[PDB]
Each structure stands twice: as C-alpha cells, then as structure tokens.
RNA sequence: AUUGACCCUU
RNA sequence: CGCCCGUCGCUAGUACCGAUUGAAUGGCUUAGUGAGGCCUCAGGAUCUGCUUAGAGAAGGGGGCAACUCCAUCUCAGAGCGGAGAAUUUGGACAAACUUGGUCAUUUAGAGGAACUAAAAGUCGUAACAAGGUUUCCGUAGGUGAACCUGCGGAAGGAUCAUU
RNA sequence: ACCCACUCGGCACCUUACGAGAAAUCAAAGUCUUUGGGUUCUGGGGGGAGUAUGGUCGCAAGGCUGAAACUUAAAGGAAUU
RNA sequence: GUCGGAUUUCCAACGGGGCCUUUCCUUCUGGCUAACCUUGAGCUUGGCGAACCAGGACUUUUACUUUGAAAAAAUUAGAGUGUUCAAAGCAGGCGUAUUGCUCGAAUAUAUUAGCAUGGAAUAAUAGAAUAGGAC
RNA sequence: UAUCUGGUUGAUCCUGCCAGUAGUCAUAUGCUUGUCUCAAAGAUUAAGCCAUGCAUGUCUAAGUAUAAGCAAUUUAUACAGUGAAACUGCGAAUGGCUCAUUAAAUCAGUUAUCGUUUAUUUGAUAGUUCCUUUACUACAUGGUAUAACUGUGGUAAUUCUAGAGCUAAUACAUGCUUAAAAUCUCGACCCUUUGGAAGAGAUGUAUUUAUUAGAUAAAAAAUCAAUGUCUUCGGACUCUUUGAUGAUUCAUAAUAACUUUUCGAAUCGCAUGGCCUUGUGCUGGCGAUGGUUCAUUCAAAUUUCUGCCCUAUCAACUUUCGAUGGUAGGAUAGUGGCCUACCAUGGUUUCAACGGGUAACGGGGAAUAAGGGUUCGAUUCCGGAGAGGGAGCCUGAGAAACGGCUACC
RNA sequence: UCUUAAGGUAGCCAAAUGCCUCGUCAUCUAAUUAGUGACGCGCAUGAAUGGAUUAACGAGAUUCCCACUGUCCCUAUCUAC
C-alpha cells in the first residue's frame, strides 16, 4: 500500500518473457507507457535475452543512452521501456527492424522486417470519442490518439498508421470473414479468418475463429486483433505463421527437419 | 529472496525393515553387481516404480488418446535409448514389466566389466 | 480524524465488527463549512491529487438563475427562509445546498425592465420594436410579480458552498414555488 | 406513496425542467430511460407521479454487473425489499449438497408493487444504501 | 441346623 | 488350599472445592477528567507597498534683495492595503486514569474433600457353584466395611416342561 | 355353536439353512467387500465417571446436559477341555 | 493396390443432421434480394429470411450434465538436453569454424462460484375450475 | 506403490485398544562425521528489550555558483572547465522484515466504477485576457530579498541555532507579445411590416450554477397573433439531417452571469544557419524543463456473486443517538448512515444469527494418500496488517508514513 | 473389659459456650488482646434441657468500607437566654 510499486520479483514477471528463475531475485518492472505491464516486453529483456546483444543491464543501458535503438521512430532511451505488441524496434547499426509479434506458443518473437514495412504499423482502436472543441478522435492499443479520424472507423477496427506522423493511412473494419491475430488467452498467437461472433448483450463478446488448417476455436472480442483482409495479410508473420500445431505434430516436425 | 531451488529424493526405503527374502535378494544384487549400499538398489527401484506408475496411468487412458500416444512414445523411446527396453518392441507391456536387474546391468559400473576393461565388477 | 469508511459500523446482521485497520487517509472526512451571509471569506483546502476545494465561510453574494427567462445575474442574499434538512439552519441563517433564501433580485428587475419595458408593482424605435416583439409574455404568474413587488425574490441554493465556494441558486417557479410557499404559510 | 410531496423537500427530477411560460397539456415533464439488457420500461414508470431518484428508469441510478432473481420475503420497508436466493452448496467429501440461502436487500421503485412470495429479478447498481446494491427490474408473480 | 480363611513371583 | 470386594492403616501423585467483599491482564462497555493535532471565532507581535500633505537645517533659472514647478538628512500627525508568529473562542477526532458492568485468559491461597498408583498390612467374606440368603436393576431406609432390608422389575436363573 | 377349505390382520411357535453371524443363535440378527430403499437416535479400549464445573428442571430426593487432569494393557463377548 | 502413413465396385456395427407419420428449425414490416414463381445460341432486371439488423415474444423457473475463455508464476505430472551421472538448470546443437547458421524455454488445471454453450432424460416448480382461460 | 505382525486364554474365535512397522521442506537432541553439488537457518517461547556500526539519497552539455576550491589554453581581442557546500526539483509511500491483530474480516476466482482519485510514462492538445476598456504597466523582456558565504558567537549537551551584510532562480507575486470567417445590445432613417449600411462590449481554458441539443426506421387538405427561400403577390418549395453504449442528465456543442483571477512558457543546452533598405536588424533548427485538458500506463479506493476452523456448558442478536430503510444536507476524490436533521420500525437468525475460543494472517502450496481422505501452510510468490501500545497530523500524486512530526501510556 | 444404663451420632465450635488463651494458621492494617474464614482430646459443644441452617424483619450486639463531617490536629467566631 501507501503508493505504487517499483520492483518486480522473478517468478512474478509474466511467463512469456522466458526469464530464468535463478540468476537474480528481481525482474525489470516495465515502466509506465503505451502497453500494459503484463503484455509488454521491455527493451532490457529484448536487447539482453531475445537478441543477446548485451550481456548486462549496464550494456543495455549504454545502448539505449547512446541511442542506437529507436522504437516507433523515436529513440526511447528507457532501460525498461514497455515495448508491447505491434511495436517496431529499429537498430541503425546493421539497419535491422524488429516487429514485436507473438509466436505460435504465446511468446514475443524476433521478427526481421524491411525498412518500408517498418515505416508503418497497425493498431487496433480501443475507443472513439469526441475530445474538446468537438474534435473526434480514436485511441489505439498502443496508447496513440488520432484526431479527425475517418468517420467510418468504429470500435474494434484497426488502423495502418504511417508511424512518421499522426495520420492514419488506412483502416480495416472488424467484420466476419477477416484475417486476425488473437492476442492473449489460451490462443495467444493464431491467425484468424473470423467466421462470426456472439454479441452476448451485457459484455464479453466471443468470436469463433478457424485457422488455415480448418481448426476452430473461440476467443474474446477484446482478445482478438485483426491484422488484415482475407487472402493477403497486411504485415508479415513470424516462422510458423501462427497455426498452433499439436504437440505430436511438432514432435514429428522436429524429428524430421531438425 | 531468490527463487527456491527445487530438490527431490531419488530413493525409497522398503516398508518392512527385516524381510529375509528381500534382504537376501538385495544382498545378492549388491554382491553380483558390486554396489556399496542398498541405497543404490532403493534408488533403482524408485525410478522403476516411477516409470511403471507412468506406464500404468498411460494404459488406463483409452487407445488413440493423444496423451497416451505421445507419452507412450516418449517413455518407450527413452527406455530403448538407455537400453533397458527391447530394441524391437514398443508394446509398452515391457514398460510395465521392466526389472531392477535390467537397470543394474545397464548401469555403467557393470558396463566396464562387460566390455572387458575390469576383470571384476569391483575392479570396475 | 473524521472517518468515512463503514468498517467502524455494525454489520448488517447487527454484529459488532472488530478492528481491522487504523484510520486511513483515503477514507477521511472533514468539518463542515457552515457558510453564512456577509463579508465573503474563502479558505482553500487541499484535497487528494491537488484538486483544491473552496470552503465557503460567510459568503455575501451569489449568482442566481431565472430558468423561464434563461437569465442569470449576481445577486445579494437577504436570508434563509426554509431548509428541508434542519430548521436550526433556518434559525441561524446557514447556507447549504437546497436552502431557500431571499434575494434582492434588483438586477433581475433591471433586466426585466430593459428587456420587456414593463413596470413592476405600482423610448427609441429599436427599443419599442424589441419590447413589442417580446411582449405578450410578461404575465408569468402572481407570485413572481409579488416577490418583485416586495423586493425579495425567493431562490433556492443549488450549489454546494462548502465545496465549490459559491452560493449559486435558481428562482422557484410554478409547482415548486407553490409547494414551498405553502410550507412557509402553513405553521 | 399516497402523495408525491409528503416530504419536507420538493421532489423533482434533477435538471429536468418544466417551462412555465408555455401553458399547454402535460405541464410537468417526466424523464425516463430504458435500462438495457432487454428489460422493458413499465408504463407505471412512464406515466407515474413519483420521483424516486433510485429508480432504474426514472431515477439517476444505472444498472450494470450482476443480474439475480429471487422470491421476496419482506415488503415491510419503504421502497426497498429483501429477496431470498436459495441455492445448493456442493461438498466433495460427502458428494452431495445442502440447502443454503442468502438474503440480498434490494430497492424497488414505485413502478413495481411486490409482496412476499413474488419472484422478482434485480440488477446490480451502485451502492444505494448501506446494504442495498440492486434494483428490481421485473416481477414474475402475481 | 452351623462350614470363615489360606502371602509375592514362578 | 482357586478367585475375589469394601472399610481401616502406610507411601506418592493428580485434579476439584475454598474465606480472602482475592490479585493480574486484556475485549467491549454508565460516566467523569481529559493531552495533542485539525477546522473555526478572534487576536495581533512583527515584516512590508500607495498618496495633491507641513517643514528644522543645502539649493539651483526667472529684471536671481518684499516670490517658485522639484526638494538632502527626513519624519513625528493622516488615510488605503498585503502577509502575518504568540495568544485564544467554539468545536470535531481522540490518546491516558477512576469508580461501575460483565466477558475471556491467567494466577496466590489457610483449609476441605475425592480419585489413582503402589511383591507379600489389618477386619470381615460381599461376588464367581444354588458362592451356601440365586444374582442384578430403580428407589428408599439402615449399617465398621464389604453390605442388609422393603417395594416394583429382569433373567443376564438354579425353570424353555403339567393335558 | 361346532367341522372343513381359503383369505386379511395379530401374539407366537416347530423344522431347516438359501443366507447371516465371533459364536450363542437369528425367517430376521437374511436380501450388507457382488458393500447405497427412506429416516431418527446412539457408540469409538478399561477406569477416573455419570464424577467436577456451568446450565436448566425439582420442595427435596434428585433428573437432563456433561468434561478433563490423572491412571491403565488389557477390561470385555461367545464358545472349548 | 501405400518402398509402418489405403482418393476407390467399402453392401457388417457406431456416433450426428434433415423430412413425413395429428409431432412449431420464439415474428407483423426492407434493404446486401433470400432453402428464389423469372436460364444467359448453357452465376435471372418481381414472394420465403434470424449461419446479421430493429418496437411486442424469450436461453416456459431451476437443479443437473456437455463443450468453450479464465482459474499469475514458482510447485506437480510431463517433451527435450551427456550439470562428467544425479538432484538440478533451462540450457544448448551444428558449419566451406574467414564469415556464421540454428532448435527450445511445450503439454493438466486441481472442489466449488461466476460467464457463455448443446441436451432435457432424472428430481422438483407453474399454467384453463364459483373460468376475471386461449386464439 | 490396495500388505500388516506381537499382546487378554490351559488352548479357541472375536471385539477392542495398546505396541510394533513406514514416511514427514517436522522440529529437537545423542553418538559419529572423509569428498562433490545444493541449501534452510531467533517462526514457535518474548509483535520482549536492545549497546554499537551500517541500511536513502540524488546530477546532465541541457534549473541556480564571484567559494581567501583545483588544473588552466588563444588558426577569432565580435562569449569553451572540473566544481566542494547551499537553494531548487525528484525520491525517501519502493524495498526489506515480521505475522501481533484479524473468522464474511483478510483472502481466492469472479465482476462493477454510467460511483471515483491518479505523480510519473506515452500520444494528442491552449492566435480571443489588459475587467471603470483608444494605456497606472519593460517584452531588442521586469521586482521581492532569501540560502551558501563573511565577524562575534550562547550553553555540559542534539543533524540546536541569533542578531548584521551582500547575492541568485525553473522560490514567490504581477505581467505581455495576431492582420483570422462569424451572434447578441447600443442607432441618425423614412412613422415601417424582404426593411439595412457607421462603430463599440462579451464569445480561450478552468465556469462541476440554471437552461437548450445530442433527433431518426410509413401516402392529403387546411383560416390561425408574425410571407422564410426564389418570387408575372395569381405560384414551386426543395437545402433541415450531429456520434457512441446493453443502458444515461454519456462524450461533446450551445445560452445567460459569477471566480476573491487556475493555465494560456519574464525558464535553460547545442555548433551556429539563411535574408537582405550591413541593423550588435529580419527569419530559423535540434532539444531539455514546465504546462490547461483529454485519452494511456503504473496505480489506488470502493464494490457484485460464491466459499473459512472449533464451540449451543453461546438462542435469540441489532435498535438513548445508527440498527435497517426513506428525504434533504454536510463531508469525501468519489457512492453509501460515512455523519447530521426529520420520519417509518425495521434488519439477521436452528439453512446456526449473535456470542466465545483459536498455541488462526489468507491463498498459491506441502506431507502422506488404490480410490475417497487426513494433517500442515510463521516462512523464497501474490494479497493483507504492523513498526513498543493506542491516537492525531504535516508534506506529498500517493502515508493516517514511523531509519516523518505531535501528544498520552 | 470396668464404673452406676449407654458411651456424644448427625452436626457445630476459642461460638453469647475454650481455663490455658492475646490458642494455631490464613486474611484484613503501617501496625489489630478486635473482625472474618479455617483447625479441633471441645477445662466444660451437640440434638423439642432442641442441633444445624435460614430469605425477611430488628431504636438488639460486633467488624470493615464508601460518603460525611469541629470527634480530633486546634481551636476561633456569631445569636438568643
């Protein structure tokens, strides 16, 4: 009590960080920012464990302070800056762009992308409102707010954002027959092809979702993130394309193509 | 504090401390496989009981169950790789019917004597 | 140390709860303003997250609204005449919300004069056309005119002086006016 | 609730205005709303004379969260009644249940007339009183 | 018709 | 010549009752006194801004010797204000004591009265045989002690039986 | 009123063991390790002890409720010679 | 016939859907025309409709059971991986080893409660009776 | 990994317990003890008391330095340091420890905030002030005097501190930097009924006063008190159209005033660019630190449903004056008997209320388990509570904080 | 077993009954030949010469406590006669 917490113990950090239980009794508490604490990947862990570029929090601090790593077009020299879903982490050294997307097994994976692809990013709108002076605006899953949006945009839609300015270049509506990326729950990391939804007047809408292998599951409306249209997807997918092969099938795949 | 490092026992003592048949069998195994204590026999019996319990709880599951299939393949393959299971039978019946003597003869201590570097298991 | 939590209270079944916590800052209360009339005095009180409140003490004048005419002017308060909460507040002339007070209503009289060109109680072409167009609507009811004649209009405080620091109010009209006038005359 | 203005204060819907300048039929303006979730606004609440700022429809309270049902056991309180929710509690050791009940106190708007034995459904609102957290939204017995 | 009792361990 | 019951005697333990209008510790709880902080009625050291004012002792142009627009040390007389420490009014929160009230947990006691445990104590022989008056139950009375006796009941009786 | 044949309901009895039981024995004490028709009450080694304490009922005698400390390896049932 | 992984003339069972048998896939009204009376020398310019919309009619009231999201990590079971074995740990493994490439950190949810969802058998609960009953 | 054996007898079946037997992140203790890995550890009794030392401070290129502080350069006489102390800002509300209290309380899943606060983070977002108004007021931009520091120190004593002198600001109070479409009143005009031209004051945000809008899903004729657009007055009338939620007095917009004046940058770093009526002019970049408000994040506070050990040698409990509810107000960041004033007599309970005990913080979990269970969980994580016992507060976004203050014991 | 028959039972007790005696122990107090509670070989308690107990009552005897006070420390003053 008495005020907000500032430490984060190991075994209490989110499991999708792949942080070992030994080697320290604390984990980097993601600072306040664009994404929630649980569903965020701090730059410390991304540049220390995910990429192994830095062997120490000191080395990550040096990297961030001298500003090689820039997130979403801004340097973001915070040692535990919360970098969550759909963020672009750019390294000017070696000119490499990472898109922060989940893998098949619910973990933020490394995802090399080209410069033109890292130019833009997609964001799910969280709510559309009218700010002061009667200016409509939309808020995204990244905490971004866009003023004077296209009047057609509604809740649960997604926006392709130029990421250089505040303009929304494109937008995709949330409708049946649309390719999504389920973010959270048991199905964290599947490509969607929505079939339909249950409104469930009162809260917690559930949408039914079949991947490419004709496997159908159910997820929550807030839990589902649309990343393109049926056919071509707006952005690239990590290795595996998020289909959640069963454990036996994964065993066969490993034993054959080790 | 730091995370708790997990530890577990690797052996179990017999229920009846003084059984003539069990004592004679264990002393026979100790003498003919060159073991320092009966704790080694207890340890091998513990692992054998663990894998037998796993196999039994596997068999209680219906056929074509994904869990039964996967866990059966894993257990059988591990036993074959170590060498206590037959290299031609994945029936899992032998998985419910391994033997402490098989585990002991698979242990390295007798492997040196078998391959002929020892001339005696205690020399090994 | 005025508290505001319900852990000090008897349980709904009637059971006496035991002590669980020391009194907490986030569950505190503070003393009443007990606003009065004359020589306006405001003390700032710092609340959670800054968010200053204005404890009105002895506030002299307020802002009152005539809803039918859509007007609001700053007015002086003569005194409290009725309070549904406590008659002691009436006897003491204490200002709280929903307290009925008498006001001079002279700015309202001047506004009505300049707006309608109608006398109360006992020139230009533009002014005349405005008055003629706005006329045929100065027959509100007997009691508003009677209050204007007596010079003390009835108005109830709709603001909270001890919180916003203003004794803002609105003039009573129609069924509300008849209700409170009946309460006043019945004794 | 024989007369609307029995209390020392004047009862009216806050920020609802009845302009006296215009004098036509229906001189007093009554504000209502539908509560959502498929519940229908009673005609009594539509055309009544009560104010009752705690009504789901005419009042300023908003209904959201849990929705329960129960048979009322007490109507001896002003504008609030107590419903009995009877349920079975499972006990694994004995692999069977016991009868358990929970009395939840609820606020009933003058649009509803209920008596002991009536089966009413209520919905969660913000804390109305020390114990009342629900509002009656329907009655299923007569 | 009266008939009470008979040490400890083994 | 088995076993066995109870007084009485000895030794050692264990609780129980117990005057002391016992004691201690807390929980709530008639009342009373009531520190301190906080709001408030005042209070007002002290610090500090504004003006057409009057001069005791310099003054400078104007025909500078019968007059001056501003004035150096400058204030005792005036009014407009701002902050404002002691002190203090009424409150509201309320810590610590008394006599009360129980509640709960401990605890000291002169003395009293039981039970239990003890290789070989005394008095009887109540029970086990029809145990020599068949046993036992409930109740009542009596009595060194087991026990005796009345009334009703049981058989777990010493009778499964009188055509 | 008797005598026959049934029938319903009683107090019981004789025979046997399908069964049950430690046995004595039991047509229920059966249909209970092939364990479940419904339901109430009671017991958890022997003593201390139906005692102490509190409560409540009674005029009382006492009734109902009712421990523990401590002590002890047997008490006990049914049968056999 | 597929070097333990069979598109088939399989004529034997099982588990689900549809229709008729007095047996109803909760409606009064339009647009993307919809189980559509209108077919183009072979994706129709005119009715039905809830796999989607609205004002009346609701998951006949439940219990119960099926499935689905959640029930933090660590712990448990459990895939892997020569920590020299092991307890552990989540590490590691391979090059034209100048450059470098690369797998993994899965899988059960722990009474019950709440939320959706199929069923409706079993066990309850109401309807039309001095008809203020239904179309 | 579904197992028993010894003990009542002369012997037998039983009941029944005693004893054995195995395990224990269950302790203690005895004897013994060579290696490797790993590792609990003043919980129990005393949340008893504590000597001593340490455990909370903090700097950049980028808020203030003339230190009787240090080391000191010139391709330009038109401007390069490190900096102890002390102001200023932030932090010290995290962590760590412990388990005393606490039995529908905490806590566990589950909800709600349309019932609230929220430093920081992130994104977006402020051309309207000069309020007795064509000037009491500088924006090539202003005051106060306050720390450090300098002399004398006052006591045995503290992280005690005074009188005098300077001097800062991102400390404090005023204060201004535009040539934007557009409404309401004040009118000379003909005594009007399409009447309209001169120029003023208000129209930023904060105003949590009153009022209006925030609508919608289906074919004609109509005199009314006042033509509205074009308009041979003989007539056509189109252009009204503003979002979300399951749901609002929702977000926002608009109308009338009030504010004792919130904010709307008198703040810093970086090598220096371009324009020329070459003026110590005009224009200009990358930042740092502030800053309305809105979202976002970290949070917080309340909150729905269900679930907790033993006890009836606890059966009725709560209810002058809070117990249940209603109305109104106060207070709160907010809802609410949270508290006041008036009224009603309600609310819980054998489906165990209320009371008492706990050698009770709750959960994740642990030991042991054929199944079903039993016992344990102070303790590596989460959530509570506490800093010797209460109580009350300052500061702060956040504390009823204790390595903060005040008072009582 | 003796004296003249029996041999003080239940109770109660330094009691209004106990000599020794201001009994012994506990408690009450700073201190107690006092008071209360116990003890009992009780000179010389004890059962309608009634024993024990007992609510209520008492101008009965006694002990302590609170309240109160000129009883006292320690006296002073006033009024009437």
From Swiss-Prot, chain A:
Give the source's domain of life in one word: Eukaryota
Pfam families xrefs: 40S_S4_C (PF16121), KOW (PF00467), Ribosomal_S4e (PF00900), RS4NT (PF08071), S4 (PF01479)
Among CDD domains, the record links this protein to: KOW_RPS4, S4
Q: Name one GO cellular component term.
A: cytoplasm
Report the residues modified as Phosphoserine: 31, 246
The protein's UniProt keywords, in alphabetical order, are: Cytoplasm, Isopeptide bond, Phosphoprotein, Ribonucleoprotein, Ribosomal protein, RNA-binding, rRNA-binding, Ubl conjugation
Per UniProt, location of the Glycyl lysine isopeptide (Lys-Gly) (interchain with G-Cter in ubiquitin) cross-link in this chain: 61, 133, 160, 167, 173, 178, 210, 232
- State the compartments where it is located: Cytoplasm
Please state every residue range assigned to the domain named S4 RNA-binding: 41-104
Q: Name one GO molecular function term.
A: RNA binding
> What GO biological process terms does the UniProt entry carry, in alphabetical order?
cytoplasmic translation; translation
Q: Ribosomal protein as a keyword?
A: yes
The family annotation for this protein states: Belongs to the eukaryotic ribosomal protein eS4 family.
Assembly with partners or alone = Component of the small ribosomal subunit (SSU). Mature yeast ribosomes consist of a small (40S) and a large (60S) subunit. The 40S small subunit contains 1 molecule of ribosomal RNA (18S rRNA) and 33 different proteins (encoded by 57 genes). The large 60S subunit contains 3 rRNA molecules (25S, 5.8S and 5S rRNA) and 46 different proteins (encoded by 81 genes).
Q: What else is known?
A: Present with 573 molecules/cell in log phase SD medium. There are 2 genes for eS4 in yeast.
Annotated protein name in UniProt: Small ribosomal subunit protein eS4A
Curated annotation (Swiss-Prot), chain B:
Cellular component annotations (GO), alphabetically ordered = 90S preribosome; cytoplasm; cytosol; cytosolic small ribosomal subunit; nucleolus; nucleoplasm; small-subunit processome
Q: State which residue ranges cross the membrane.
A: none
**Has UniProt tagged this entry with the keyword rRNA-binding?**
yes
Any one GO biological process: maturation of SSU-rRNA from tricistronic rRNA transcript (SSU-rRNA, 5.8S rRNA, LSU-rRNA)
Which keywords accompany this UniProt record? Cytoplasm, Isopeptide bond, Nucleus, Phosphoprotein, Ribonucleoprotein, Ribosomal protein, Ribosome biogenesis, RNA-binding, rRNA processing, rRNA-binding, Ubl conjugation
Chief location: cytoplasm
Which is one GO molecular function term here? rRNA binding
* Role according to the record: Component of the ribosome, a large ribonucleoprotein complex responsible for the synthesis of proteins in the cell. The small ribosomal subunit (SSU) binds messenger RNAs (mRNAs) and translates the encoded message by selecting cognate aminoacyl-transfer RNA (tRNA) molecules. The large subunit (LSU) contains the ribosomal catalytic site termed the peptidyl transferase center (PTC), which catalyzes the formation of peptide bonds, thereby polymerizing the amino acids delivered by tRNAs into a polypeptide chain.
State the similarity comment.
Belongs to the universal ribosomal protein uS4 family.
Protein name as it appears in the record: Small ribosomal subunit protein uS4A
The source organism is Saccharomyces cerevisiae (strain ATCC 204508 / S288c)
Gene name of the record: RPS9A
Please indicate which part of the intact protein appears here, giving the first and last residue numbers and the full length.
Answer: 2 to 125 of 197
From Swiss-Prot, chain C:
Task: Provide this UniProt record's keywords sorted from A to Z.
Answer: Cytoplasm, Phosphoprotein, Ribonucleoprotein, Ribosomal protein
Describe the subunit structure.
Component of the small ribosomal subunit (SSU). Mature yeast ribosomes consist of a small (40S) and a large (60S) subunit. The 40S small subunit contains 1 molecule of ribosomal RNA (18S rRNA) and 33 different proteins (encoded by 57 genes). The large 60S subunit contains 3 rRNA molecules (25S, 5.8S and 5S rRNA) and 46 different proteins (encoded by 81 genes).
Among InterPro entries, the record links this protein to:
Ribosomal_eS8, Ribosomal_eS8_CS, Ribosomal_protein_eS8_euk, Ribosomal_Se8/biogenesis_NSA2
Protein name as annotated? Small ribosomal subunit protein eS8A
Instruction: State the residue spans of region: Disordered.
Output: 1-30
Q: Which family does it belong to?
A: Belongs to the eukaryotic ribosomal protein eS8 family.
Organism this protein belongs to: Saccharomyces cerevisiae (strain ATCC 204508 / S288c) (Baker's yeast)
Q: What is its main location?
A: cytoplasm
State the remark under miscellaneous. Present with 15900 molecules/cell in log phase SD medium.
Compartments reported by the entry:
Cytoplasm
Task: State the Pfam families in the record.
Answer: Ribosomal_S8e
Gene Ontology biological process terms from the UniProt entry: maturation of SSU-rRNA from tricistronic rRNA transcript (SSU-rRNA, 5.8S rRNA, LSU-rRNA); translation
Give residues where Phosphoserine occurs.
65, 68, 72, 85, 142-143, 146, 149
Q: Please name the gene that encodes this protein.
A: RPS8A
Q: What is the lineage of its organism?
A: Eukaryota, Fungi, Dikarya, Ascomycota, Saccharomycotina
Swiss-Prot record, chain D:
Q: Name a biological process GO annotation.
A: maturation of SSU-rRNA from tricistronic rRNA transcript (SSU-rRNA, 5.8S rRNA, LSU-rRNA)
Q: Which UniProt keywords apply?
A: Acetylation, Cytoplasm, Isopeptide bond, Ribonucleoprotein, Ribosomal protein, RNA-binding, rRNA-binding, Ubl conjugation
- Is-annotated flag, keyword Ribosomal protein? yes
Q: Where in the cell is it found?
A: Cytoplasm
| InterPro entries in the record | NA-bd_OB-fold, Ribosomal_uS17, Ribosomal_uS17_arc/euk, Ribosomal_uS17_CS, Ribosomal_uS17_N
Q: Which SUPFAM superfamilies match?
A: Nucleic acid-binding proteins
The keyword Acetylation appears for this protein: yes
- List all membrane-crossing ranges: none
Give the record's PTM text.
N-terminally acetylated by acetyltransferase NatA.
Give cross-link positions for Glycyl lysine isopeptide (Lys-Gly) (interchain with G-Cter in ubiquitin): 12, 43, 53-54, 76, 93, 102, 130, 138
Naming one, the record's GO cellular component terms include: cytosolic small ribosomal subunit
Question: Which GO terms fall under molecular function for this chain's record?
Answer: rRNA binding; structural constituent of ribosome
- This protein's source sits in the domain of life called Eukaryota
Q: What else is known?
A: There are 2 genes for uS17 in yeast.
The UniProt function text for this chain reads:
Component of the ribosome, a large ribonucleoprotein complex responsible for the synthesis of proteins in the cell. The small ribosomal subunit (SSU) binds messenger RNAs (mRNAs) and translates the encoded message by selecting cognate aminoacyl-transfer RNA (tRNA) molecules. The large subunit (LSU) contains the ribosomal catalytic site termed the peptidyl transferase center (PTC), which catalyzes the formation of peptide bonds, thereby polymerizing the amino acids delivered by tRNAs into a polypeptide chain.
Family membership:
Belongs to the universal ribosomal protein uS17 family.
Q: Which NCBIfam families match?
A: PRK08572.1 (NF006345), uS17_arch (TIGR03630)
This protein is called Small ribosomal subunit protein uS17A
């Amino acid at each position: 009590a008495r005020g907000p917490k500032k430490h984060l113990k190991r075994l209490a950090a989110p499991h999708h960080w792949l942080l070992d239980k030994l080697s320290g009794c604390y984990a980097p508490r993601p600072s306040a920012g664009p994404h929630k604490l649980r569903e965020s990947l701090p730059l410390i862990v991304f540049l220390r464990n995910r990429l192994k570029y830095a062997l120490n929090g000191r080395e990550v601090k040096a990297i961030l302070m001298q500003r090689h790593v820039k997130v979403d077009g801004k340097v973001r020299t915070d040692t535990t800056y919360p970098a969550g879903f759909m963020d672009v982490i750019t390294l000017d050294a070696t000119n490499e762009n990472f898109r922060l997307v989940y893998d098949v097994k619910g973990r933020f994976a490394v995802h090399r992308i080209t410069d033109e692809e890292a130019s833009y990013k997609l964001g799910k709108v969280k709510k559309v409102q009218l700010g002061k002076k009667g200016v409509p605006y939309v808020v995204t899953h990244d905490g971004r707010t866009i003023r004077y949006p296209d009047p057609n945009i509604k809740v649960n839609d997604t926006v392709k954002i130029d990421l250089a300015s505040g303009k929304i270049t494109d937008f995709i509506k949330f409708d049946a027959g649309k390719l999504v990326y389920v973010t959270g729950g048991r199905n964290l990391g599947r490509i969607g092809t929505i079939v339909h939804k249950e409104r469930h007047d009162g809260g917690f809408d559930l949408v039914h979702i079949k991947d490419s292998l004709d496997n159908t599951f159910v997820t929550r409306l807030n839990n589902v993130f649309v990343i393109g249209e049926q056919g071509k997807p707006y952005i690239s997918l990590p290795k595996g394309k998020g289909i959640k092969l069963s454990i036996a099938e994964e065993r066969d795949r490993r034993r054959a193509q080790q | 504090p730091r995370a708790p490092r997990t530890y577990s026992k690797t052996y179990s003592t017999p229920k009846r401390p003084y059984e003539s048949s069990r004592l004679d069998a264990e002393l026979k195994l100790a003498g003919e496989f060159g073991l320092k204590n009966k704790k080694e026999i207890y340890r091998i019996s513990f692992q054998l009981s663990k894998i037998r319990r796993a196999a039994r709880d596997l068999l209680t599951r219906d056929e074509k169950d994904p869990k039964r299939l996967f866990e059966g393949n894993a257990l059988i393959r591990r036993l074959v790789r170590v060498g206590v299971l037959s290299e031609d039978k994945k029936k899992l019946d032998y998985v419910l019917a391994l033997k402490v003597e098989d585990f002991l003869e698979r242990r390295l201590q007798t492997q040196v004597y078998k391959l002929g570097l020892a001339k005696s298991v205690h020399h090994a | 140390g005025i508290s505001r939590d319900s852990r000090h209270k008897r349980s709904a079944t009637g059971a006496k709860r035991a002590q669980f916590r020391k009194k907490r800052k986030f569950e505190l209360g503070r003393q009443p303003a007990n606003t009065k009339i004359g020589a306006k005095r405001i003390h700032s009180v710092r609340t959670r997250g800054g968010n200053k409140k204005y404890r009105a003490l002895r506030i002299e004048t307020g802002n009152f609204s005539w809803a039918s005419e859509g007007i609001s002017k700053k007015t002086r308060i003569a005194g409290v005449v009725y309070h549904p909460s406590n008659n002691e507040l009436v006897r003491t002339n204490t200002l709280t919300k929903a307290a009925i007070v008498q006001i001079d209503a002279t700015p309202f009289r001047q506004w009505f004069e300049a707006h309608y060109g109608q006398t109360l109680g006992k020139k230009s072409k533009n002014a005349e056309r405005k008055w003629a167009a706005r006329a045929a609507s100065a027959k509100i009811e007997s009691s508003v005119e009677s209050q204007f004649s007596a010079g003390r209009l009835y108005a109830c405080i709709s603001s909270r002086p001890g919180q916003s620091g203003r004794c803002d109010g609105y003039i009573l009209e129609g069924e509300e006016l008849a209700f409170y006038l009946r309460r006043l005359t019945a004794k | 609730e024989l007369t609307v203005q029995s209390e020392r204060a004047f009862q009216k819907q806050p920020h609802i205005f009845n302009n006296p300048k215009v004098k036509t039929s229906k001189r007093t303006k009554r504000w209502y709303k539908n509560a959502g979730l498929g519940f229908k606004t009673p005609k009594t609440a539509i055309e009544g004379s009560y104010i009752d700022k705690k009504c789901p429809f005419t009042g300023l309270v908003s209904i959201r969260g849990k929705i329960l049902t129960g048979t009322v056991v007490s109507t001896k309180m002003h504008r609030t009644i107590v419903i009995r929710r009877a349920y079975l509690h499972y006990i694994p050791k004995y692999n069977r249940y016991e009868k358990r009940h929970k009395n939840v106190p609820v606020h009933v708007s003058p649009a509803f007339r209920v008596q002991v034995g009536d089966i009413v459904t209520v919905g969660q609102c913000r804390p109305i009183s020390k114990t009342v957290r629900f509002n009656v939204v329907k009655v299923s017995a007569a």
